[PDB]
Design a protein around this nucleic acid. Structure first.
Ligand SMILES: [Mg+2]
Ligand SMILES: [Mg+2]
Ligand SMILES: [Mg+2]
Ligand SMILES: [Mg+2]
Ligand SMILES: [Mg+2]
Ligand SMILES: [Mg+2]
Ligand SMILES: [Mg+2]
Ligand SMILES: [Mg+2]
Ligand SMILES: [Mg+2]
Ligand SMILES: [Mg+2]
Ligand SMILES: [Mg+2]
Ligand SMILES: [Mg+2]
Ligand SMILES: [Mg+2]
Ligand SMILES: [Mg+2]
Ligand SMILES: [Mg+2]
Ligand SMILES: [Mg+2]
Ligand SMILES: [Mg+2]
Ligand SMILES: [Mg+2]
Ligand SMILES: [Mg+2]
Ligand SMILES: [Mg+2]
Ligand SMILES: [Mg+2]
Ligand SMILES: [Mg+2]
Ligand SMILES: [Mg+2]
Ligand SMILES: [Mg+2]
Ligand SMILES: [Mg+2]
Ligand SMILES: [Mg+2]
Ligand SMILES: [Mg+2]
Ligand SMILES: [Mg+2]
Ligand SMILES: [Mg+2]
Ligand SMILES: [Mg+2]
Ligand SMILES: [Mg+2]
Ligand SMILES: [Mg+2]
Ligand SMILES: [Mg+2]
Ligand SMILES: [Mg+2]
Ligand SMILES: [Mg+2]
Ligand SMILES: [Mg+2]
Ligand SMILES: [Mg+2]
Ligand SMILES: [Mg+2]
Ligand SMILES: [Mg+2]
Ligand SMILES: [Mg+2]
Ligand SMILES: [Mg+2]
Ligand SMILES: [Mg+2]
Ligand SMILES: [Mg+2]
Ligand SMILES: [Mg+2]
Ligand SMILES: [Mg+2]
Ligand SMILES: [Mg+2]
Ligand SMILES: [Mg+2]
Ligand SMILES: [Mg+2]
Ligand SMILES: [Mg+2]
Ligand SMILES: [Mg+2]
Ligand SMILES: [Mg+2]
Ligand SMILES: [Mg+2]
Ligand SMILES: [Mg+2]
Ligand SMILES: [Mg+2]
Ligand SMILES: [Mg+2]
Ligand SMILES: [Mg+2]
Ligand SMILES: [Mg+2]
Ligand SMILES: [Mg+2]
Ligand SMILES: [Mg+2]
Ligand SMILES: [Mg+2]
Ligand SMILES: [Mg+2]
Ligand SMILES: [Mg+2]
Ligand SMILES: [Mg+2]
Ligand SMILES: [Mg+2]
Ligand SMILES: [Mg+2]
Ligand SMILES: [Mg+2]
Ligand SMILES: [Mg+2]
Ligand SMILES: [Mg+2]
Ligand SMILES: [Mg+2]
Ligand SMILES: [Mg+2]
Ligand SMILES: [Mg+2]
Ligand SMILES: [Mg+2]
Ligand SMILES: [Mg+2]
Ligand SMILES: [Mg+2]
Ligand SMILES: [Mg+2]
Ligand SMILES: [Mg+2]
Ligand SMILES: [Mg+2]
Ligand SMILES: [Mg+2]
Ligand SMILES: [Mg+2]
Ligand SMILES: [Mg+2]
Ligand SMILES: [Mg+2]
Ligand SMILES: [Mg+2]
Ligand SMILES: [Mg+2]
Ligand SMILES: [Mg+2]
Ligand SMILES: [Mg+2]
Ligand SMILES: [Mg+2]
Ligand SMILES: [Mg+2]
Ligand SMILES: [Mg+2]
Ligand SMILES: [Mg+2]
Ligand SMILES: [Mg+2]
Ligand SMILES: [Mg+2]
Ligand SMILES: [Mg+2]
Ligand SMILES: [Mg+2]
Ligand SMILES: [Mg+2]
Ligand SMILES: [Mg+2]
Ligand SMILES: [Mg+2]
Ligand SMILES: [Mg+2]
Ligand SMILES: [Mg+2]
Ligand SMILES: [Mg+2]
Ligand SMILES: [Zn+2]
Lengths: 77, 91, 112, 50, 252, 63
RNA sequence: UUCAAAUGAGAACUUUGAAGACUGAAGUGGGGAAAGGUUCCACGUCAACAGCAGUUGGACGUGGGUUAGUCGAUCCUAAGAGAUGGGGAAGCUCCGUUUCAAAGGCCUGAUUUUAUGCAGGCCACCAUCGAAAGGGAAUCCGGUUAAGAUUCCGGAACCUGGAUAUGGAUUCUUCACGGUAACGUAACUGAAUGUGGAGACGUCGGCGCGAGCCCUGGGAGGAGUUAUCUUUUCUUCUUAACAGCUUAUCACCCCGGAAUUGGUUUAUCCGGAGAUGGGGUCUUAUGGCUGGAAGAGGCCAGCACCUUUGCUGGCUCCGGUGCGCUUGUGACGGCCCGUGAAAAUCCACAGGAAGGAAUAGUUUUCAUGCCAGGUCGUACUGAUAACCGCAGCAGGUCUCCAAGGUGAACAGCCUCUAGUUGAUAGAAUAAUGUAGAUAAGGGAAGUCGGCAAAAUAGAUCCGUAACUUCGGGAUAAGGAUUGGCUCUAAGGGUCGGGUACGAUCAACUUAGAACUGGUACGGACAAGGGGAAUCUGACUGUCUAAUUAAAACAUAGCAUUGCGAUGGUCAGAAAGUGAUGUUGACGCAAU
RNA sequence: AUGGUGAACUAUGCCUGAAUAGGGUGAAGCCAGAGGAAACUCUGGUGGAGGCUCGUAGCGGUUCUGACGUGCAAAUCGAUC
C-alpha cells in the first residue's frame, strides 16, 4: 500500500525483523520522448503493508540487488 | 414594464377564491415577505420565517414579533405603557 | 449500455443505499456503495464550520490523530477563534468594570 | 422467505426429509398393510402454512 | 343506532395529538427560593417555532443555584423578546418585557402572559399567539390580584401567581384567509384529526341526531339542554341565546 | 451522414420542427450565454485599462 | 413462423445448425423486498400431470448444492407494545410506565492473615420488546463451480477488542515548538464535574462542478462489404478497495481605509460592525500523479496435440467536444396559520484531582510490531408457470440499473446488447358474427338523444368577441405557411500587446435567398372540433370495491353555541383511570 | 342469547421509507430605458409564482349502455375518457 524513495530507509526495512519475503519486478518502459529504459520495483512485504521502491536507473538497481540480505527470500520477477 | 394592473404578488392565485379574499391575503403577504430594519445593527436585513419569528440576515439576532409583521400595533402600545408604569417605580 | 445491480439485499433508494458506478480492472461496470457524506463540526458560540478540524463521520474520529481534532489556541477545536476574542475582551472588561462598581458603592456606603 | 429465521428453515428442512416414496421393503413385511405414502406433499399443490 | 362522532373522539384513537415534532412543553421556572425571594438571571439562547403552535417558543437557559451546571427552560416568547437578551425572574425582579414577576409586584394596568392560575403551576393563562391578561387592581390583604383574561372574564388570583411581562408573540395569525382547503389541511396535520367536518345533517339517522329525512334539515330545536346525555349533545349546547349577534358586545 | 447534413444547416425547416422554438433551445439559455459574455468582456477591459473603472461600472448595470 | 440434420419404437412440439420475426432498454434484459420452500443443479426418466403431443418440464425417480471479523440480522431508538411497589375488579383480569416506591452500579483505593470485607467521591440514569427501507465500526479487485460467492482461491486492506515491546517524540525552563494572524505538526500527561459538536433530517427552481453513459479525431490490432463505390463499416485499447502527495466553491486572517460609491450573480446583494485591491489560513466533496499495478484483465499473432490441454511471442498508446443523458454534490433562491424524528454511539473543549526527571524519568491520540473476532441467514423464483386469486387464471402484488436514430421528449415507430420465438395442429373461406376499414349524391331527414363514427390536431407567423373578481375568457374564433437540395448573413473560447488589431480552436441555433417535383412536404408515428345560451355546483379535491361520480360529500369564506382547569366536550364495570392536553380563548369542543 | 376469533381486503390516525417523460403559461423581486411643469405614467428585459395548464407513467373508472356474459376473470378485456 506504500511507496518508498529513500534508498537508505529502504534497506532498513529489508532488515526489519518481521520481513520474510520480498520481490523484484522488472518493467520495460519508455523514456521522455524517444527510446525506452528498464525500470525496476523493489517490493518488501511488511506484516501490515507492502512497501515498494522504484529505481528507474538500472545502474543503481544492479548494485542494490546484491545488498539484499542473504537470508531474505527474494522472488525474482 | 408594469406587469399586473392590481393583483401584485397575489397574481399566483389566478381567478380562484374571489377578489376580496385575495385583497386581504395580498396585504399580509406584502407584509410578511418584505425586509425590515434591524433595531440592533441598523441594516434592513430582518426577514421572516414561521410566524412571529424575525431574524437578522447578518448579525443573526432573532426577535419575536407579529405573525406577518415585525412589530404589531398592540405590542408596541404595550411596550409604551410598560415604560410608563416602570417609570413610576424609580421616579 | 452496461447496466448494474445493488450489491446488498436492500433494493430501495434509501440514504444508506447510495450507489456509484465504477470501471474495474476487468473492463466492466460495477456498483459501489457510498457512505453518507460526513459534515463539518460547528462552533458552539456562533455555529459555523470551524476550520482546522477534519470532517469525518463521528466514530471515524476515534481513528485519527488528536491534531486532526483541534487547533492550538484555547477552546481549540470547540469555538471559532473570532468567537474566542469576543469572550476574552468581554471577560477582561467585565472583571474590570466589576472593580469599578465596587469602589463606587463603597463610596456610596462611604459618603451619602 | 429468502432470508429466514432458523426456526422456519428447520421446519423447512424437516419437510424436505418427509418427501419420499414408500421405502419399498416395508411392503414385504408380514401383515404389511401400507401400499403407498399417503401423506406425501408437493410444493405447488399444497402450501405448508409456514 | 351508531355511536356518533363526538362520542368517539373521547376514547382517543385516531383522535389524539400529533406530537412527534413539538418542541417540548412550555412552562415557567419551578417556584424555587431564588424566583420567590429575589430574582435570577437567564439568557434567551434561541427563539424557535413550535410545531402545531401559533406562537414561537423561546429557549431560556439558567444557572443551577444548587449544583454546578445549566438548566434550560422552555418559555412562550412574548413579543419583542430577542436572542441574547437577559431575563430576570423573581419577586424582586424589574418591570421589563420578558421578565417574570408575581402579579403582586406589578401596578394596575400591567400587561402579562402565561400567567399562573395558582402560584407555581408554571403558567396557565393567556398563551395563544396574541393573547394577554391585564392586572386591574389588587387587594393587598389575603394578597389577591384581580385580572382580566383574554375572554373578557375577570378572575381574582393569588398575588404570588407569576406572569411574564408583555404579550405573546405571533399575533395577527388568524387575520389571514386560509384561502384553500389544503392550508387548513396542513394546519390540522400538526394538531389532531379534527378536519374535515361532515355535517350531521348529511348523515343517516344511525349516525346523528340530525340524520335522515327527504330534505336536509335539523328537524327539531338544535339548542340542546346541559342535562342532555351522551349522544344528545350535538348542536348548540346550553345556548342561552341564539341568532346573529346584533350590536356591540364587549363585556360591561 | 445525416448529422453532417444537419450541421450544414439542412432539414431544419418549419416542417421539420416539432417542439416549440422555446423547447428546442430555451430563451433563458441564450440570455445567460449573451449576458456572461458581456459581463466578462467588461472585466478584461477594466483589468487592462482600455476601460476606466467608472465607465465599466455604468456598462455593467447597463448590460 | 420455416428448412435440414441429430436422437428416438414413435418427432408439427426435444437437441443442434440455418432462416424469418419479436421484446426494443418505462424489456420478454440484469438483480432484489414480501411470499414460496428446493422449485436451483446433475444423472436417470414418461404411468399420472402440462384441457393436441411429448423423447421435453417448475412432473417422476435418485443424488449433489447455500462457506463472511467487514453483507444482513444481532445494537439503537420511532408510532407503539409492556413487566414491576401500587390502585381497581367476585374473578378471567383492568389501570399506571416513573407512576405516592427504603428501586441500583461504577471507579479505584484500602488487603500485602486472602481474596475482595470497607475507606472517599461520585451517578440518581428507573425495566424490557418494537425497523432484514430509519440510525449504524470496518473489504476490494482478479479468478474459480454442474449448482456458491463483496462469504472459497489469489493478492492487497481496514475495523473492533486484547495484549505489548522497539524506535521516535518529550523533560535540567519538566507536562512540544513554530506562525503578527487565520492556523501548522508524526507525536506533544490530564480524574471528578461541566459543556459543545457530530449522529440529525422539508420541498421545488435555476445556476456551478464531479462520475458513469453518449458523441468523436489519430494510431495499433481483429472482423465484415468490395460487379462498382467507400484512406470504409463493425469491434478491442481497461485500472478496485486502500495508501502518499497534490487539488475547493464556501469560510477566515494580515496589510489597507472607500462618493465620481465600488464590487458583483443567470437570479440584487454586499461594504467604516472595514468594501474593491494585494498578499495568506482552512474543510478535502472531487479530481490529478504515483504506490496497489500489470504480475491482473482485454485484443492478436506464431508453433505444438486423443490427451491434462499447454508453449512462445507481441500490442494494451495519444487526444477532441457539450443548454447532451442518468445520477451525484455545491453555493444560492422560492414556499408555509406546514418551518419538515429519536436514541445508541464517536469526538472535542472548560476544568486541573493527581502523577512525573539529570543520573535519569514521562509518555501509546506518532510509526512499526503480536494475538483474537462466536451465533443464525446466504440455493433459486420474484411472476401471461416458483407469490395471492380452487389452476402453469389475459386479474392482483413494493423497488434499483437503463444504449443509437427520428422528435420537445423516459411518447410512438425502427434498431445494438441481452432474451425470446412459449400461446394445439391441418384444410377451406357459406350464413350470422367479433375486431380493422372504404363508399357515389344528400347531410341528422336516423334516433329518447349525433349513441357510434367522422372532422380537428405539431410548429412558425398573422389575427382574436361578449363578459370579468382584471388574474382571465384564449390554442377564443379566423387565417397562411411547412419537402429536398444549394448558398448568404448573425450569434462564441484561448492566448501574448509600453507602465488599433492580429493568431487559432470548437459548437446547432435563428433569419434570409436561389434552384427543384404530377402542388407534395407535422408525408408513417404523433396530435385540441368550434361557437351562442338555459339549469345547476364557485373552484382543485371526495364517495356507493361489484348496476348511481351527480346537482350528492368536502372546502375556503360567513355565522351561531359551550368553556378560565374545582372547566367544556368525550371515554370507562371500576379506579391513585383516560382522550382533547407537549393544550389555555389568535384555544379546544359542538352546530 | 352467551362466550369467543378477525384491520393479510378496506376505512381513518400516527411512525418510518420510496416514487412522478416532455410541453404551455409567465405572478413577486430585480436591471436598463422613454414621456411629463408637476403628480406621476410608460416601454424592453430579467426572474420563475400557482391545491395553474397540455399530456405520459402513476392513481381513477366516463361512455360505448362495445367484448365476455357455463368468461381469462365471483368485476375481467378493448377503445374512449
Ligand atoms: Mg460503443
Ligand atoms: Mg445480492
Ligand atoms: Mg488541526
Ligand atoms: Mg487538518
Ligand atoms: Mg399458488
Ligand atoms: Mg389453497
Ligand atoms: Mg349503539
Ligand atoms: Mg399522546
Ligand atoms: Mg380526517
Ligand atoms: Mg361545519
Ligand atoms: Mg365551516
Ligand atoms: Mg362540513
Ligand atoms: Mg345521505
Ligand atoms: Mg332529537
Ligand atoms: Mg337517532
Ligand atoms: Mg333530519
Ligand atoms: Mg338545510
Ligand atoms: Mg424567461
Ligand atoms: Mg447555460
Ligand atoms: Mg464568457
Ligand atoms: Mg451597482
Ligand atoms: Mg409450433
Ligand atoms: Mg421491433
Ligand atoms: Mg418506449
Ligand atoms: Mg414470458
Ligand atoms: Mg435471483
Ligand atoms: Mg415458491
Ligand atoms: Mg431445472
Ligand atoms: Mg405416456
Ligand atoms: Mg404439472
Ligand atoms: Mg395434454
Ligand atoms: Mg399423452
Ligand atoms: Mg427430484
Ligand atoms: Mg432432491
Ligand atoms: Mg456492517
Ligand atoms: Mg450479536
Ligand atoms: Mg400493564
Ligand atoms: Mg430492540
Ligand atoms: Mg436496521
Ligand atoms: Mg438499515
Ligand atoms: Mg468474481
Ligand atoms: Mg463449489
Ligand atoms: Mg447464481
Ligand atoms: Mg481472502
Ligand atoms: Mg495477506
Ligand atoms: Mg488496537
Ligand atoms: Mg517537535
Ligand atoms: Mg453530549
Ligand atoms: Mg446537539
Ligand atoms: Mg433520519
Ligand atoms: Mg471502502
Ligand atoms: Mg487570495
Ligand atoms: Mg501573509
Ligand atoms: Mg431517480
Ligand atoms: Mg429551514
Ligand atoms: Mg468532533
Ligand atoms: Mg485525591
Ligand atoms: Mg496507536
Ligand atoms: Mg443469490
Ligand atoms: Mg418463471
Ligand atoms: Mg396470472
Ligand atoms: Mg427470463
Ligand atoms: Mg389458449
Ligand atoms: Mg385453425
Ligand atoms: Mg357518402
Ligand atoms: Mg355540407
Ligand atoms: Mg341542420
Ligand atoms: Mg322520426
Ligand atoms: Mg328528428
Ligand atoms: Mg331526452
Ligand atoms: Mg323527442
Ligand atoms: Mg361520442
Ligand atoms: Mg374521409
Ligand atoms: Mg368562448
Ligand atoms: Mg421551400
Ligand atoms: Mg460565423
Ligand atoms: Mg332547462
Ligand atoms: Mg364541482
Ligand atoms: Mg358502484
Ligand atoms: Mg351493496
Ligand atoms: Mg367525476
Ligand atoms: Mg360508475
Ligand atoms: Mg357568500
Ligand atoms: Mg382510588
Ligand atoms: Mg392493513
Ligand atoms: Mg427523497
Ligand atoms: Mg416534470
Ligand atoms: Mg404544447
Ligand atoms: Mg408539468
Ligand atoms: Mg425628462
Ligand atoms: Mg415552469
Ligand atoms: Mg392541477
Ligand atoms: Mg390538467
Ligand atoms: Mg405531448
Ligand atoms: Mg384520483
Ligand atoms: Mg373499462
Ligand atoms: Mg355492456
Ligand atoms: Mg356469447
Ligand atoms: Mg388519458
Ligand atoms: Zn442586525
Amino acid at each position: 500500500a506504500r511507496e518508498i524513495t529513500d534508498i537508505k530507509q529502504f534497506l532498513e526495512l529489508t532488515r526489519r525483523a518481521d520481513v520474510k519475503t520480498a520481490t523484484v519486478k522488472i518493467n520495460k518502459k519508455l523514456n521522455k520522448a524517444g527510446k525506452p529504459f528498464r525500470q525496476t520495483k523493489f517490493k518488501v512485504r511488511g506484516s501490515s503493508s507492502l512497501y515498494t521502491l522504484v529505481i528507474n536507473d538500472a545502474g543503481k538497481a544492479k548494485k542494490l540487488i546484491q545488498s539484499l540480505p542473504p537470508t531474505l527470500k527474494v522472488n525474482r520477477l | 414594464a408594469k406587469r399586473t394592473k392590481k393583483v401584485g404578488i397575489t397574481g399566483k392565485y389566478g381567478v380562484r377564491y374571489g377578489s376580496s379574499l385575495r385583497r386581504q391575503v395580498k396585504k399580509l403577504e406584502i407584509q410578511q415577505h418584505a425586509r425590515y430594519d434591524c433595531s440592533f445593527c441598523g441594516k434592513k436585513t430582518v426577514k421572516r420565517g414561521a410566524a412571529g419569528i424575525w431574524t437578522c440576515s447578518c448579525c443573526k439576532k432573532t426577535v419575536a414579533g407579529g405573525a406577518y409583521t415585525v412589530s404589531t400595533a398592540a405590542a408596541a402600545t404595550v411596550r409604551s405603557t410598560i415604560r410608563r408604569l416602570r417609570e413610576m417605580v424609580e421616579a | 449500455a452496461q447496466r448494474v445491480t445493488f450489491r446488498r439485499r436492500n433494493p430501495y433508494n434509501t440514504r444508506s443505499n447510495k450507489i456509484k458506478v465504477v470501471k474495474t480492472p476487468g473492463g466492466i461496470l460495477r456498483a459501489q456503495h457510498v457512505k453518507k457524506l460526513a459534515t463539518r463540526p460547528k462552533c458552539g458560540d456562533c455555529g459555523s464550520a470551524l476550520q482546522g478540524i477534519s470532517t469525518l463521520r463521528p466514530r471515524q474520529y476515534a481513528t485519527v490523530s488528536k491534531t486532526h481534532k483541534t487547533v492550538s489556541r484555547a477552546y481549540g477545536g470547540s469555538r471559532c477563534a473570532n468567537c474566542v476574542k469576543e469572550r476574552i475582551i468581554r471577560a477582561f472588561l467585565i472583571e474590570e468594570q466589576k472593580i469599578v462598581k465596587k469602589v463606587v458603592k463603597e463610596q456610596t456606603e462611604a459618603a451619602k | 422467505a429468502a432470508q429466514k429465521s432458523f426456526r422456519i428453515k428447520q421446519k423447512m428442512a424437516k419437510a424436505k426429509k418427509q418427501n419420499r416414496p414408500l421405502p419399498q421393503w416395508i411392503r414385504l413385511r408380514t401383515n404389511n398393510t401400507i401400499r403407498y405414502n399417503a401423506k406425501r406433499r408437493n410444493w405447488r399443490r399444497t402450501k405448508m402454512n409456514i | 343506532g351508531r355511536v356518533i362522532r363526538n362520542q368517539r373522539k373521547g376514547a382517543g384513537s385516531i383522535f389524539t395529538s400529533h406530537t412527534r415534532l413539538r418542541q417540548g412543553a412550555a412552562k415557567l421556572r419551578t417556584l424555587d427560593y431564588a424566583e420567590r425571594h429575589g430574582y435570577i438571571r437567564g439568557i434567551v439562547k434561541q427563539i424557535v417555532h413550535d410545531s402545531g403552535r401559533g406562537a414561537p417558543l423561546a429557549k431560556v437557559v439558567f444557572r443551577d443555584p444548587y449544583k454546578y451546571r445549566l438548566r434550560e427552560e422552555i418559555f412562550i416568547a412574548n413579543e419583542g423578546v430577542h436572542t441574547g437578551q437577559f431575563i430576570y425572574a423573581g419577586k424582586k425582579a424589574s418591570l421589563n418585557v420578558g421578565n417574570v414577576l408575581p402579579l403582586g409586584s406589578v401596578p394596575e394596568g400591567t400587561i402579562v402572559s402565561n400567567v399562573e392560575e395558582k402560584p407555581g403551576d408554571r403558567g396557565a393563562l393567556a398563551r395563544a399567539s396574541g393573547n394577554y391578561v391585564i392586572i386591574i387592581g389588587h387587594n393587598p390583604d389575603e394578597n389577591k390580584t384581580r385580572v382580566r383574561l383574554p375572554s373578557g372574564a375577570k378572575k381574582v388570583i393569588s398575588s404570588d401567581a407569576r406572569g411574564v411581562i408583555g404579550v405573546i408573540a405571533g399575533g395577527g395569525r388568524v387575520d389571514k384567509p386560509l384561502l384553500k382547503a389544503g392550508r387548513a389541511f396542513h394546519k390540522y396535520r400538526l394538531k389532531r384529526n379534527s378536519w374535515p367536518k361532515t355535517r350531521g345533517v348529511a348523515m343517516n339517522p344511525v349516525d346523528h341526531p340530525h340524520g335522515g329525512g327527504n330534505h336536509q334539515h335539523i328537524g327539531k330545536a338544535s339548542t340542546i339542554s346541559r342535562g342532555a346525555v351522551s349522544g344528545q349533545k350535538a348542536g348548540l349546547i346550553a345556548a342561552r341565546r341564539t341568532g346573529l349577534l346584533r350590536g356591540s358586545q364587549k363585556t360591561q | 451522414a445525416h448529422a453532417q447534413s444537419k450541421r450544414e444547416g439542412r432539414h431544419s425547416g418549419y416542417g421539420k420542427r416539432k417542439g416549440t422554438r422555446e423547447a428546442r433551445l430555451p430563451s433563458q439559455v441564450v440570455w445567460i450565454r449573451r449576458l456572461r459574455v458581456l459581463r466578462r468582456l467588461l472585466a478584461k477591459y477594466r483589468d487592462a485599462g482600455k476601460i476606466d473603472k467608472h465607465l465599466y461600472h455604468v456598462l455593467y448595470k447597463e448590460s
